[PDB]
CSV table of C-alpha atoms in Angstrom, one decimal:
chain,number,residue,atom,x,y,z
X,1339,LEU,CA,91.3,160.3,129.1
X,1340,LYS,CA,90.4,156.6,129.0
X,1341,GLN,CA,86.7,157.0,128.1
X,1342,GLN,CA,87.3,156.0,124.5
X,1343,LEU,CA,89.6,152.9,124.5
X,1344,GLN,CA,87.2,151.9,127.3
X,1345,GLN,CA,84.1,152.8,125.3
X,1346,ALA,CA,85.2,151.4,121.9
X,1347,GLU,CA,86.7,148.3,123.6
X,1348,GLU,CA,83.2,147.3,124.8
X,1349,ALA,CA,81.7,148.1,121.4
X,1350,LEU,CA,84.5,146.4,119.5
X,1351,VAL,CA,83.7,143.2,121.4
X,1352,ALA,CA,80.0,143.8,121.2
X,1353,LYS,CA,80.3,143.7,117.4
X,1354,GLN,CA,82.5,140.6,117.5
X,1355,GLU,CA,79.3,139.1,118.9
X,1356,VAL,CA,77.3,140.0,115.9
X,1357,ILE,CA,80.0,139.0,113.3
X,1358,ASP,CA,79.8,135.8,115.4
X,1359,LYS,CA,76.0,136.0,115.6
X,1360,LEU,CA,75.9,136.0,111.8
X,1361,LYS,CA,79.1,134.0,111.4
X,1362,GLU,CA,77.8,130.5,112.4
X,1363,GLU,CA,74.2,131.5,111.7
X,1364,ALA,CA,75.4,131.6,108.1
X,1365,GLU,CA,76.9,128.1,108.0
X,1366,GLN,CA,73.4,127.2,109.0
X,1367,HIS,CA,71.9,128.9,105.9
X,1368,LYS,CA,74.4,126.9,103.8
X,1369,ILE,CA,73.5,123.4,104.8
X,1370,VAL,CA,70.0,124.2,103.7
X,1371,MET,CA,70.5,125.6,100.2
X,1372,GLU,CA,72.5,122.4,99.8
X,1373,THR,CA,69.4,120.1,100.2
X,1374,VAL,CA,67.6,121.9,97.3
X,1375,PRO,CA,69.5,120.1,94.5
X,1376,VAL,CA,68.9,116.8,96.2
X,1377,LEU,CA,65.3,117.6,97.2
X,1378,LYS,CA,64.7,118.1,93.5
X,1379,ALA,CA,66.4,114.8,92.5
X,1380,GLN,CA,64.0,113.0,94.9
X,1381,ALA,CA,60.9,114.7,93.5
X,1382,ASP,CA,62.3,113.7,90.1
X,1383,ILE,CA,62.9,110.0,90.7
X,1384,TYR,CA,59.6,109.6,92.6
X,1385,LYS,CA,57.7,111.4,89.8
X,1386,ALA,CA,59.6,109.0,87.5
X,1387,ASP,CA,59.0,105.8,89.6
X,1388,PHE,CA,55.4,106.8,89.8
X,1389,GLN,CA,54.9,107.2,86.0
X,1390,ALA,CA,56.5,103.8,85.6
X,1391,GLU,CA,53.7,102.5,87.9
X,1392,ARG,CA,51.1,104.6,86.2
X,1393,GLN,CA,51.9,102.9,82.9
X,1394,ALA,CA,52.6,99.6,84.6
X,1395,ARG,CA,48.9,99.4,85.5
X,1396,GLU,CA,47.6,100.8,82.2
X,1397,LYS,CA,49.3,97.8,80.6
X,1398,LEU,CA,47.9,95.4,83.2
X,1399,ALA,CA,44.4,96.9,82.9
X,1400,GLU,CA,44.2,96.0,79.2
X,1401,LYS,CA,45.3,92.4,79.7
X,1402,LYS,CA,42.9,92.0,82.7
X,1403,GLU,CA,39.7,93.9,82.0
X,1404,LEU,CA,39.8,91.8,78.8
X,1405,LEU,CA,39.9,88.4,80.6
X,1406,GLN,CA,36.6,89.5,82.3
X,1407,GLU,CA,35.2,89.7,78.8
X,1408,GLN,CA,36.2,86.1,78.0
X,1409,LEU,CA,35.2,83.9,80.9
I,385,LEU,CA,91.4,154.9,119.6
I,386,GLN,CA,92.9,154.8,116.1
I,387,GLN,CA,93.0,151.0,115.8
I,388,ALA,CA,89.5,150.9,117.1
I,389,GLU,CA,87.8,153.7,115.3
I,390,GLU,CA,89.2,151.7,112.4
I,391,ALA,CA,87.1,148.7,113.4
I,392,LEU,CA,83.8,150.4,114.2
I,393,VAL,CA,83.9,151.4,110.5
I,394,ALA,CA,85.7,148.2,109.4
I,395,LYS,CA,83.5,145.6,111.3
I,396,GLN,CA,80.5,147.7,110.3
I,397,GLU,CA,81.3,146.5,106.8
I,398,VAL,CA,81.5,142.7,107.3
I,399,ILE,CA,78.2,143.0,109.3
I,400,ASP,CA,76.7,144.7,106.2
I,401,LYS,CA,78.2,142.0,104.0
I,402,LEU,CA,76.8,139.2,106.1
I,403,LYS,CA,73.7,141.4,106.2
I,404,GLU,CA,72.9,141.4,102.5
I,405,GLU,CA,74.5,138.0,101.7
I,406,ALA,CA,72.0,136.6,104.2
I,407,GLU,CA,68.8,138.1,102.8
I,408,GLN,CA,69.9,136.3,99.7
I,409,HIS,CA,70.2,132.9,101.3
I,410,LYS,CA,66.7,133.5,102.7
I,411,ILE,CA,64.9,133.4,99.3
I,412,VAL,CA,65.9,129.9,98.5
I,413,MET,CA,65.0,128.5,101.9
I,414,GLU,CA,61.5,129.9,101.2
I,415,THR,CA,60.9,127.2,98.6
I,416,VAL,CA,62.6,124.3,100.3
I,417,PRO,CA,59.4,123.4,102.2
I,418,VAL,CA,57.4,123.3,98.9
I,419,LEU,CA,60.2,121.2,97.4
I,420,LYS,CA,59.6,118.8,100.2
I,421,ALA,CA,55.8,118.7,99.7
I,422,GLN,CA,56.5,117.7,96.1
I,423,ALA,CA,58.8,114.9,97.0
I,424,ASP,CA,56.1,113.8,99.5
I,425,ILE,CA,53.2,113.7,97.2
I,426,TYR,CA,55.2,112.0,94.5
I,427,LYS,CA,56.5,109.5,97.0
I,428,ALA,CA,52.9,109.0,98.0
I,429,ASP,CA,51.4,108.9,94.4
I,430,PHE,CA,54.1,106.4,93.6
I,431,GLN,CA,53.2,104.3,96.7
I,432,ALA,CA,49.6,104.4,95.7
I,433,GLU,CA,50.4,103.1,92.3
I,434,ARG,CA,53.1,100.8,93.7
I,435,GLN,CA,50.4,99.1,95.7
I,436,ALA,CA,47.5,99.5,93.2
I,437,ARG,CA,49.8,98.0,90.5
I,438,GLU,CA,50.0,95.1,92.9
I,439,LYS,CA,46.4,94.6,93.9
I,440,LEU,CA,45.7,94.7,90.1
I,441,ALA,CA,48.4,92.0,89.5
I,442,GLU,CA,46.5,90.0,92.0
I,443,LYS,CA,43.7,89.4,89.5
I,444,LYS,CA,45.9,87.9,86.8
I,445,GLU,CA,46.0,84.6,88.6
I,446,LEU,CA,42.2,84.4,88.5
I,447,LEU,CA,41.9,85.4,84.8
């Protein structure tokens, strides 16, 4: 008469291993979707730093290509 | 068997919660690597210009 509280007890602890499998394996999935907002801010400032360098060479290509016209 | 058969029906819920809620968290993570390749190319495009904007500020002394 003990083939159920002996059957379920091994399955009730075999499930605590999957609510544990997915428990911590979910705090993993968190730390990642938390690098997306920052990973965008990085792309943004670099895109921005870059455009400042794009235009900071198109203003130093006018006052330089010119001096090779008057020498 | 009545506090257990109430957990192989109860803990089959939280494993379905953390089942779906996890397929969700998988879609974002898909993009993360592309989001890195963007940061990388911009960091690099910027570094290209950062340096080119310098080698071109090298010929301001001569002219």
